[PDB]
Amino acid sequence: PKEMLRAQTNAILLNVLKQGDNYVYGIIKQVKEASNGEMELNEATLYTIFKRLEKDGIISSYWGDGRRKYYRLTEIGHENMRLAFESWSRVDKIIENLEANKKSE
Amino acid sequence: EIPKEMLRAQTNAILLNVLKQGDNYVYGIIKQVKEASNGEMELNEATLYTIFKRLEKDGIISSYWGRRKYYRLTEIGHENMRLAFESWSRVDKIIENLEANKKSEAIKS
């Protein structure tokens, strides 16, 4: 499901930035390496995603050094990742509790 | 805040699990979720109907008729839960490897 691929890619890209400011080609290599070559991101895909995240204030950019454009997770972005991770833990709990409670009937 | 696209996902995630554990009707679903959430999540009836209309359209669930309307997980539905779970395992692995590789990046330098 397209809805899901998008989410997972975003998930990953934010984790990369959560590990350090980086530029598009560095991000691509890092992901290709952490995925054992299973996820080879196109440049244009990253620009698409980052344009949305920059508009929503979840990331921002700036010039580094060979002059590269760097991307960073904002404070809001670290906050969304935190809210997200928490909300999903509760969800996994509630699922366990559904099972538990169902069996006790 | 939590993007609306994500609250929807979480709710769907939960609802499919309920159905994965047995065909059920809206009131039973609501009750079950309220109980398994220690009251923290009360789904509104009309919200369930809206979600189930989408899932029925996508054939993820189907329904049948005491007098309660029941909802069941289809085989497509069982399959998407499996694909979902697997896709997300790989994703967690990728993220574990990002951490790992970052730490050994940091050792060397």
Numbering used by the authors:
A (entry chain A): 5 to 69, 74 to 113
B (entry chain B): 3 to 67, 74 to 117
What did the article's authors report about this structure?
We present a new class of ArMs featuring a genetically encoded noble‐metal‐binding site based on a non‐canonical thiophenol‐based amino acid, 4‐mercaptophenylalanine (pSHF), incorporated in the transcriptional regulator LmrR through stop codon suppression. Next, we investigated the incorporation of pSHF into Lactococcal multidrug resistance regulator (LmrR), which has been demonstrated to be a highly versatile protein scaffold for artificial enzyme design. We selected position V15 for incorporation, since this places pSHF inside the hydrophobic pocket at the dimer interface. Here, we report a new class of artificial metalloenzymes featuring a genetically encoded thiophenol for binding noble metals and the application of this design approach by the creation of an artificial gold enzyme that shows efficient catalysis of abiological hydroamination reactions.
Optimisation of the expression temperature, as well as the addition of the reductant tris(2‐carboxyethyl)phosphine (TCEP) during protein production and purification, minimised modifications of the thiol group. Using the optimised protocol, after affinity chromatography purification, LmrR_V15pSHF was obtained in yields of 75–145 mg/L cell culture. LmrR_V15pSHF is envisioned to have two specific metal‐binding sites per dimer. To our delight, LmrR_V15pSHF binds a variety of noble metals, albeit with varying degrees of efficiency and sometimes accompanied by oxidation.
